Design a protein around this ligand. Sequence first.
Ligand SMILES: Nc1ncnc2c1ncn2[C@@H]1O[C@H](COP(=O)(O)O)[C@@H](O)[C@H]1O
Ligand code: NA
Length: 152
Amino acid sequence: RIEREQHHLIESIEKSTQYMAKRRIGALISVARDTGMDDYIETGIPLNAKISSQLLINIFIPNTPLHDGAVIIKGNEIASAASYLPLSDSPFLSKELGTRHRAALGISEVTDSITIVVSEETGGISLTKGGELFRDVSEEELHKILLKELVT
Ligand SMILES: Nc1ncnc2c1ncn2[C@@H]1O[C@H](COP(=O)(O)O)[C@@H](O)[C@H]1O
Ligand code: NA
């Protein structure tokens, strides 16, 4: 069932981001939707892998081949790792945030994707959507947002 994959995806993002937030591991996960992100998948290393919290964690371990860039989830697959996303040049984004946030903001400005960031500085979890940034969200807030936006 597609609903079982969607709840598994939400659960996979929740557990992986909690694990990386606790250890201040930077992360950048873009979930494609109606708007295609195929051009950005082509920039990364193709995985075409089943979604799991364990694989998402292993990708973002620092100083590893797959950690430098964005993971893109498409359908029920982790499509790619270490992909480029377009950077926002918006001057409204706080300068205390990192390039991952700028990339999450940039992709959200030109797609309808949902993008999750884990800051390697603070461990806070942020989300971008439609050019907006939800900064340092709680587990409860992250859960409700993913439920509302990823479950059809
Ligand atoms: N255009 C981009 N698209 C996706 N991820 C990026 C991009 N530029 C930088 N990154 C990520 O941000 C990290 C560097 O962050 P910083 O040290 O704040 O510049 C890189 O190692 C990548 O993981
Ligand atoms: Na596969």
